[PDB]
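Archive entry. Fields below.
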Amino acid sequence: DNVGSLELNNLSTAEDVATLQNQLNKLAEEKHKRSTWKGLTFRIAVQDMWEALTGIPTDIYQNSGRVSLKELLTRDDRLRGLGLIFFLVAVVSIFFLA
Amino acid sequence: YGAQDVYLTGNPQITFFKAVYRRYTNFAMESIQQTFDGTTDF
Amino acid sequence: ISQLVSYGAQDVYLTGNPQITFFKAVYRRYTNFAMESIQQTFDGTTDF
Amino acid sequence: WLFFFALAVIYMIYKRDVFKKIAVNLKMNGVSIPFVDKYSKQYPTYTKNALFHVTRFNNAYQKTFEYKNISIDTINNLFSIRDDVLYNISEIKLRLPNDLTQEKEINYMYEKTDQRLMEYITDVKSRFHINIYPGTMSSAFEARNYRASNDI
Amino acid sequence: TSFVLMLLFTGIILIATNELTYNRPREIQYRYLPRDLDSFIRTQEMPSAIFSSMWDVDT
Amino acid sequence: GAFTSFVLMLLFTGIILIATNELTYNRPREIQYRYLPRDLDSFIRTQEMPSAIFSSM
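PREDICTED_STRUCTURE:
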């Protein structure tokens, strides 16, 4: 519902400055998305795995706030961590059975 | 960047004759006596 | 005029980015209405 | 809320009956349990009443990890219950014979039980960031390595 | 547990790729204030902002 | 049995992956509205004339 976001203070920013800031924002959240797309990072992967391990029990125990199942499997990119944990266990298990 | 901002709600208003009372912080005032260091005289 | 000329660094807090104008009035959205004084009457005796 | 756990194990034979009825019992929350139960044979009344209230305390406490329950009422509920547990223990103390070895042991029960109840209510107090203590600074808690000149 | 393990390999690949379904708001657009509130700002009787409270605005 | 399950799993996986990428490309970009006040010069230039309140006349 917080669709409209306003900065009340008179920044006195002109039209070109608004365009520059808009471009900066578009780049910022474009990179933010790119931090979660197929272009990941090993450090990001480990951080997301730890976040999943600390968050999936957290929301199922209803620790922080009311949150539905679809949200709490996805709210903080937790499905990435779940997938990478299952990745590691699957690889270390297929290697062992050999 | 976001220095002093609010979320913004569209809501048609009566142009006038509606008192719009804007919400404030939870504060309270008390008169508290302070004491003097040194003689308080002429 | 010297007062205007004098603008310095210390005045950046009063004037600088011209955030408000004193010389150009602004108005709030205004609508059309009218007032009339209309008598109401009393149900029951109006006395001491 | 109820939940009935079904164990989906089939050794052989799929011609299963279905239990469509509700048979959900509640479990004990094994936290904050009074220290001495030797009195259960002498004061059945108070021993079981205190344990009832303890169970209630413990259920009330486990619910504190649900954020939605965050608030003053939650903490005050626990203080009220805390007093009911201690009330029944105190009623045992008040009914002991003039035997100071029983007085010391029930006092042990009382104060230590209070230290546990109080530690847990201060647990939730702290994490909810609500600093209220309508428990008249019970002497059982906070003080460590020192006691006031007032004892048995 | 080899069959379920291959199922896990399938699931890990699929889930690791499939994240791009839910995300924060994506595109930022900047629009000038409506006349009423902008004119209200640039006059007196303007208190400081709080970063919240979803200010009501005329239409 | 294991090989058939494996190849069917890879086929279904590829079908889901390729299809999902196209749908992700056709994602309705949620847009948030940030409002910035007009600069004083621009405000004076584009300020509404008192005829905008001509309802009294």
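CURATOR_NOTE: Helices of chain C lie at 2-5.
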